[PDB]
Design a protein around this ligand. Structure first.
Ligand code: HEM
Ligand code: HEM
Lengths: 155, 158
């Protein structure tokens, strides 16, 4: 896996834009998943805030952030070491949770799709490219693959 | 029972939009197929590899035939909900659909992704003057009900 500094930079600087506006963007991201695959949003709770009808669960925002943060971290690792180097304790845990809630390939792929959609939508038209798309995809795909190694018996 | 409300208007919306797709069928099918692969590569990959050994998504007859089915059967479900008040897929045909999809690991997310792609195709291919939220909802209702029937034969009658 050759993951260049340029590719990493595409991920970092695009993320820096989503971070500046993380509350509004997280909600658009969540509602995108709900649009594509309502059953994914079902794996969590329903509804809870300050007497609000919106889709504002705390755990949904936190999870959204985790996906983006860890994928970004994963970009960093591919550059530095050419592989995902997340703590083996963290990987076992991620493994166990996702298998417990019955997350399959379809779910990981829906989230990938909504993640890329969100980035394209939120960053300026001239920052976006197939190169940006592939930089994020590669990182995500490598992170998902490592989690899945811990979702099945000793290879 | 589940309260059916499928109208003549809804059926008409499905049918005339269906007529539009058939003027550019091969190309529309291919775009629908690339939508699925874009959202859920795995969904697409269930349609095999060795027996034909045809690499490309673009070449797979199973894929083209399957797309045709999703659309055609959904149209019929429109017509059936309107006339009969329910999906009237003959029962051997229905048991066979439930078997085949259970056999290939098809779950709720898969059914939703296909709906997502079907609605995309509908919005992308029909003229902006023609398209409306009502048109989207008519397709969704017909599709949802067809899926509800197939799923009944994918779980214990229990
Ligand atoms: C790269 C992708 C993803 C990352 C990095 C990620 C990360 C996480 C993390 C850090 C947690 C906290 C749970 C724990 O570790 O104790 C979590 C929980 C969870 N994740 Fe993911 N996740 C990913 C994809 C998905 C997908 C695709 C789904 C479902 C469509 C999903 C469903 C869940 C569920 C249901 C929980 C449990 C949350 C709860 O207890 O309410 N995750 N995920
Ligand atoms: C309203 C929705 C759908 C309809 C009407 C439909 C209809 C069909 C039909 C008629 C067959 C013919 C095989 C047989 O049973 O003899 C079939 C096969 C199959 N379908 Fe579906 N399907 C639907 C949704 C899905 C979804 C969501 C998936 C997966 C993402 C899927 C995956 C398959 C697979 C893998 C086969 C077997 C391949 C083959 O033998 O050709 N289908 N479907």
């Amino acid at each position: 896996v050759s993951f260049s500094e340029e590719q990493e930079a595409l991920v970092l600087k695009s993320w820096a834009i989503l971070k500046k506006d993380s509350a509004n963007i997280a909600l658009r991201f969540l509602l995108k998943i709900f649009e594509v695959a309502p059953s994914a949003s079902q794996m969590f709770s329903f509804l809870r805030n300050s007497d609000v009808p919106l889709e504002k669960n705390p755990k949904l925002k936190t999870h959204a952030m985790s996906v983006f943060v860890m994928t970004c971290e994963a970009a960093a690792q591919l550059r530095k070491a050419g592989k995902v180097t997340v703590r083996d304790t963290t990987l076992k845990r991620l493994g166990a949770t996702h298998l417990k809630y019955g997350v399959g390939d379809a779910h990981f792929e829906v989230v990938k799709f909504a993640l890329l959609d969100t980035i394209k939508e939120e960053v300026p038209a001239d920052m976006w490219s197939p190169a940006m798309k592939s930089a994020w995809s590669e990182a995500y795909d490598h992170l998902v693959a490592a989690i899945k190694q811990e979702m099945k018996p000793a290879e």
